[PDB]
């Protein structure tokens, strides 16, 4: 991600391939998770479900 700041940034799926076709019907819990560094595990800053 870049800059961020107080203003919200149009991010995530702009022209990406994150679209997933589900199989079972029901309630699914999608989970965004932010990390400081790009190494496993790193530091999880926040996680909105």
């Amino acid at each position: 991600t870049g800059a961020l700041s107080t203003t919200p940034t149009a991010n995530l799926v702009s022209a990406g391939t994150y679209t997933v076709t589900y199989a079972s019907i029901g309630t699914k819990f999608v989970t965004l998770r932010l990390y400081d560094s790009a190494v496993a595990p790193g530091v999880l800053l926040a996680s909105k479900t």
């Binding site: 919200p8 999608v30 965004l32 932010l34 800053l45 926040a46 909105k48």
Partner: peptide
């Protein structure tokens, strides 16, 4: 440290 998110 503080991060507001939406989804």
């Amino acid at each position: 440290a503080t991060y507001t998110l939406t989804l």
